[PDB]
Amino acid sequence: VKDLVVLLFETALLSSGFSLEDPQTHSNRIYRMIKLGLGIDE
Amino acid sequence: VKDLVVLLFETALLSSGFSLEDPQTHSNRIYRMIKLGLGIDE
Amino acid sequence: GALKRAEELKTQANDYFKAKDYENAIKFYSQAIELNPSNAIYYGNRSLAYLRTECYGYALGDATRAIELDKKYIKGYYRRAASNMALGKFRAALRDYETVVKVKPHDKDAKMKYQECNKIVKQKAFERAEDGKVTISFMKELMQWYKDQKKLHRKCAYQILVQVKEVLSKLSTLVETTLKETEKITVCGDTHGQFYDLLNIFELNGLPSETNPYIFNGDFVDRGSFSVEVILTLFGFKLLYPDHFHLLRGNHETDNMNQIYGFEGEVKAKYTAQMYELFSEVFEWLPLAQCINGKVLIMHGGLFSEDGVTLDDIRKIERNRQPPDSGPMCDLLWSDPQPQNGRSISKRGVSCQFGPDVTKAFLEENNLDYIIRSHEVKAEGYEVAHGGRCVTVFSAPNYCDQMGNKASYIHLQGSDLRPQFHQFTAVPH
C-alpha cells in the first residue's frame, strides 16, 4: 500500500502542472519497473 | 521495442530539466503498466 | 528375500488415510520405506499423509524421491510444488508446475494450476517494484525509538559496532563468569529479530543492569522484520554492561545465512552495504559458549561429534572466521540431541546429533552439571531431555507469526543452579 500510494501521488502530482522535487527517484523507479518487466532480476 | 523506446525517451526528457507537452499520455502508460502488474485484465 | 514386505504395508498404511489416521499412516509409511527404500509409489503416498499434519519442510524432500525414481509420477510431482507453495517461496513451485506440460498433452486442468501459480509471482514482482558511550537516557531513548519504528543514526550505529567489536575481541572463546551465592542471572534463547518480544522480556523480567545480569543464546537476527533493531539494542546493552551482558555466537550470525534469511537484505534496505560488512566483522568475535560456576555450560549449538572435547579445547578456538563445514565450531553452532543412544546424521544436513550418553560423558569429563542449548523451536518454550542433563530454552514466541508457540527464559541462582523456567506469550507487534 505504501508503494502504491507513493507512486499514485507522484504521477498525479506530475500530471497537474507541478514540478517534482527530485526527478532522479521517479526515473529510477521507472527503470526498475521496466527491468522487472523484461527479466533481469537481482 | 517501439513502446520501450518512447517510454525511455520520455523519461529521459523528464529527468533532464525539460517540460513535457502531453503528460496525460505518460500517465496513461503508467496506468496501463500498473493494471498489467496488479491483476485486472482490462 | 525381502521383496514381499512391500505391498503388505500398502493396504494398511493407506487404509488409515480413510479413517483420518494420518499419525499411524506415517508410522507405517516409515516401515515399508524402511524395508524398501526404492519404490516411488510409497514415497508419494507418504507425502499426503505427512502434508496434512502442517509439516511441510520434510515433505518437501520426501516428494523429491518419488520424482527421481519415476519422472512420470505426476502424483508425487504435484505435491512437491504444493509443499513449496505451503512454505510460500516462489521459483521451485513454479518450476515444478511448468515441468508438467512437457510430459503431458493439452489436457484439461493441467495448465490452470500453472497459471494460478503464475498469478502470485506477479504480486511478488510488484512487491519488488552521549560522547559515544551509551547511557541510561540513551538506551531508553533508543528503546522508545525502535518501539516507534525509525532507524538509528548511521554514525551512532557505526560507533556502537566499533565499540562492541573492541570489547568482544578481548574476551576468550569460553567466557568464564563466576556467580555469587545470591544475584540470579537470566538466560534467553533465540530472538530472531523479534524486538517487540524482547520488549516483553525486558518488561516482565526487568531491564538488564549490574543487579539483573542477562545473557542470550544467539540467533538475534534472520526470519524477522526487526533484526537490525534487535541486534543494535543488544550491542548497546553489551556496551553499557560489559560484565553483566553476554552475547553468544549463533548459527544465524553467519554471512552464508545472513545473505539468505533476510538480515543482509534488511541491513541493505535500512543502511549501506558496508554497514552489513561491519555487522559481519563484529559478529565473528562473539563467544561460542559460556561457563557459569564451572557447573553450567551454555552454547547455541551443543555438543560435538569428536569424543575428547574439553573446556581447554573450547577456549582454544579461533572465533574470528566463518564456521567450517565440520569440526568443533560447526557442532558448537549446529548440533542437536537425540532421544536414542549414539550419534546420527543431523536432520539439518550439517553437524551431527548427540545422545544422552554423549551428554553424560561430556558432563563427567568437564565436571559440569547440565547443558543449555536453544537452536530450536519448542511448543512450551522449554524442553528437558537426557534426564535433565539437556535443557532447551526458547525466547521467540510466535516464531514466524505461524507457529503460535509460547516462549520462556531461565533464571539461574548461584546457590541452586537448577533452571527456573519463566514463560511468556505472543505479545503481538
Solved with: cryo-EM
C-alpha cell at position B16: 533532464
In A, minimum Cα distance to B30 occurs at: A11
Minimal C-alpha gap between A24 and chain B (Å): 7
The β-bridge relationship of strands C185-188 and C214-216 is parallel
Report the alpha-carbon distance of residue C6 to residue C43 in Å, rounded.
Answer: 12
CB pairs under 8 A between A and C: 10
C126 contact B CB<8A: yes
A32 contact C CB<8A: yes
From chain B, the residues in CB contact with C123 under 8 A are 38
B5 contact C CB<8A: no
A14 contact B CB<8A: yes
Question: CB–CB of A3 and C125 under 8 A?
Answer: no
User: Could you tell me the resolution of this structure in angstroms?
Assistant: 3.9
Question: CB–CB of C125 and B37 under 8 A?
Answer: yes
* CATH code, C397: 3.60.21.10
Residue C337: φ, ψ to 5°: -85, 165
Report the alpha-carbon distance of residue C148 to residue C196 in Å, rounded.
Answer: 11
3-state helix, strand, coil in chain A (%, to 5): 65, 0, 35
Q: What DSSP designation does C401 have? A: S
Q: Is C412 helix (H, G, I), strand (E, B) or coil?
A: strand
End-to-end CA distance of chain C: 59
From chain A, the residues in CB contact with C125 under 8 A are 36
Report the alpha-carbon distance of residue C291 to residue C270 in Å, rounded.
Answer: 36
The interface residues of chain B toward chain C in range 7-26, judged by CB-CB distance below 8 A, are none
In B, minimum Cα distance to A34 occurs at: B4
3-state helix, strand, coil in chain B (%, to 5): 70, 0, 30
Annotated catalytic residue C252? yes
Cell 524442553 sits at which residue? C383
Beta-ladder partners of C298 = C290, C372
Q: Is C422 annotated as a binding residue?
A: no
Which structural domain range is residue C282 located in?
136-424
Report the alpha-carbon distance of residue C57 to residue C347 in Å, rounded.
Answer: 11
B40 contact C CB<8A: no
End-to-end CA distance of chain B: 22
Q: Is C223 annotated as a binding residue?
A: yes
Burial of A11 (0-12, 13-18, 19+ CB in 10 A): middle
Report the alpha-carbon distance of residue C121 to residue C90 in Å, rounded.
Answer: 7
In B, minimum Cα distance to A9 occurs at: B27
Q: At what angle do helices B2-15 and A23-37 cross, to 10 degrees?
A: 160
